[PDB]
Amino acid sequence: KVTCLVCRKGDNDEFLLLCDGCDRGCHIYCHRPKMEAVPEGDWFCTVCLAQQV
């Protein structure tokens, strides 16, 4: 179900970041700036960042 925002594939799911604000995702290797690992705690996608104040 989860696909990457940048490349639109849902493969290599161990490399797939999952947004804590919605159901969107992103391969760590697709992200810019460089992300060498899935972080702990919370990651927010760009659509969620746009809802912050």
Contacts to Zn ion by CB under 5 A: 4, 6-7, 19, 21-22, 24, 27, 30, 45, 48
Cβ nearer to Zn ion, comparing 2 with 6 = 6
Let me know the angle formed at the C-alpha of 3 by 30 and 41, rounded to the nearest 5 degrees: 70
Question: Counting contacts by CB under 5 A, is residue 21 touching K ion?
Answer: yes
Cβ nearer to Zn ion, comparing 6 with 38 = 6
- HSE, side-chain direction, 13 A CA sphere, residue 45: 20
**Minimum distance, C-beta of residue 1 to Zn ion, in the bound complex (Å):** 14
